[PDB]
Amino acid sequence: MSLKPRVVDFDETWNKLLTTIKAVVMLEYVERATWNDRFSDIYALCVAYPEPLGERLYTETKIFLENHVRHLHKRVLESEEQVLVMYHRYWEEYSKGADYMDCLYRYLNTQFIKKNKLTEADLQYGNEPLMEIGELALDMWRKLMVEPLQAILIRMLLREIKNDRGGEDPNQKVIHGVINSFVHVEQYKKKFPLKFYQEIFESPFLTETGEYYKQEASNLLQESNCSQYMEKVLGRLKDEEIRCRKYLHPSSYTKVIHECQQRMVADHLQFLHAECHNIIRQEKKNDMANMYVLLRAVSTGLPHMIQELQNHIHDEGLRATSNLTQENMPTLFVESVLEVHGKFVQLINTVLNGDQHFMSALDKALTSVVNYREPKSVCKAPELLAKYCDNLLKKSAKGMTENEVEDRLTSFITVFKYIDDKDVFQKFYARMLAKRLIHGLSMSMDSEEAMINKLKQACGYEFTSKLHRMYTDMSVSADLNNKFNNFIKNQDLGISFQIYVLQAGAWPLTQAPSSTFAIPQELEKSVQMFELFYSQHFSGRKLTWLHYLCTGEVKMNYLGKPYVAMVTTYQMAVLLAFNNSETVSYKELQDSTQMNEKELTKTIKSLLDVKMINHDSEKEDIDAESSFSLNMNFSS
Amino acid sequence: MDVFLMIRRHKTTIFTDAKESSTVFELKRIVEGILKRPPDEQRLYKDDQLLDDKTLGECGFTSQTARPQAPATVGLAFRFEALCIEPFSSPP
């Protein structure tokens, strides 16, 4: 015989198929040759020549399955307190059997059911519609196993889960298989594959979980402090996570944990905020480590405690930055903040998992701390911060290592970001730097250049524009003084002369000379030589001397010993009037120097204070008629 | 190159693919792998020509003559029994 359609006896072949499927559902041994023969018979009946009896086969299979499932329901109802395990066994048998008939009835589904099955669109916009035999089996199982016994099975599952929560572990295998069965029964439904599971089990389970964990939270709160209660909370969270991963479907996991966070933690947000006021003050290294994760789970837990940390650091930094000694305030002020900042940084990353908000909350207070105007001086913080630079930039005798300066400078930058009016710092730094270079007080240009580059990287080229030209100005100036000397060689000053050319756009020396100084003849020749020279190599320019800042060394031979002391330009002009006359009146000095009374007297006062001259008038106050005599008996 | 060969002994038939440079020994190893018969008992007959226990290309089995739709033809005999092949069923 061949595959041609023919008239086949429905009854005999149907009985053979019934015997075969009855063996299959019980997973009994079946002959492979009998397997193939059943396939052949199924195909023959599907294409039965008088009429395709595939609908009749479907009806007969549905009826037999209904009888079998009703018998299974009776058997389940017979068992008491054993319902879960033996139902799990029946499901395990029946799922495999259903797959076996799905393979058995593949021809019926493909050729008959599929060609007649209602589309999903019709059902969505809409006799039981035809479904595949596997879908039929699962649907009728859910109808006749899950629906009739649903209350009992849910109750038993909840009881077992609660027993596990009490430490009494039931069989994970049976309950997990039953849950997976609940997932499995509607797996053929394309839309909402977890709808039935959520409807019949997940919602009541979540409700009971919330109730039980609310009671547990009440019990633990009544029996423990904040720290013990929160540790128990963490333990319960991890234990319920393990429980869910053991039993429940994965999709519900995040739900259940959320529920355990809600009824059992968020219901007492006020309790969490009540004891954190002191937990951070005590600096409990391990408590905030677990206190952080709990507030992250709840929506509003973190922000309130975040601010409380800001209040603590605000006061903590203030105490470390309030009792500064008025003598060594700058160097210690930088160190005081640095350790306060350095300690909390390691605290946040380690204890608080390196939360970005806490790092942000840290700078919210440190900026308020560094920029605070604690001393009576108004906004002295950038000023005192500035003076720290000189301590690390001034060439001191046996000065500490420049490399050991470098890392200190890097640590200094951290405080630099916290300053409010960073521009004001620049102005203070510039003039303070101006003194350091004009006298060579800086140990090296390179050390200063590191600050220049770092500041430019810190606040752009424009913020360091004056400083960069400032640093550059003297670096080239060394060659200019040398190159000027070559001009004398190329072409007699009589004195040792040095000069710095200053770029007027950057040097903070806006004090224009109000009084017209009279350059001494001994200095006038050098002035003439340089000004003529400057135009030679640098034309189209204008020069302007600030004599009062010019410095020079003066050697007198009138004393018993040659004494050399550094003096200013105004100081030299006054003393040069004594190289011809041992006594000079005030008016003669005024005529010779053309100085104003205020500064000339101040200049004269310095000489009298050092006893370079002797005031010939009995009054301690100097007038226009004051006469001054040289100090022929001065000794040092 | 891949060559498709159907080996036939009586009603028994085995379909396989091998290399054109493969010899009788490889397909014999296939015979011990499935049917477990010693190679000396195995005897190959390409039509009536006994094949030397010689590559398939040397025997005349090429890609053109051995295709998935037109597999090459050869008969298997076992201990020396004469080659016996039962003809296929006749289509209507």
Binding site: Q498, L502, L543, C550 | -
Partner: protein, 70 residues
């Protein structure tokens, strides 16, 4: 006489020669000292004072005016 060091500012004559606001020497002569502020802009102290008595903003960059140095 033993030694001397000299410091002198450098600027181009052509770029600045007169008070920008008033065509007159900036040395106490308006149509009057050299007023100074953080803008580093110098005009007759007479004109600067009357501007400040009128408007409390820099004439050039237009910000609040505070004196720098003198």
């Amino acid at each position: 006489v033993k030694k001397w060091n000299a410091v002198a500012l450098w600027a181009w004559d052509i770029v600045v020669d007169n008070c920008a606001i008033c065509r007159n020497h900036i040395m106490d002569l308006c149509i009057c000292t050299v007023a100074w502020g953080v803008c580093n802009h110098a005009f007759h102290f007479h004109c600067i004072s009357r501007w400040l008595k009128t408007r409390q903003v820099c004439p050039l960059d237009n910000r609040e005016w505070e004196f720098q140095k003198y």
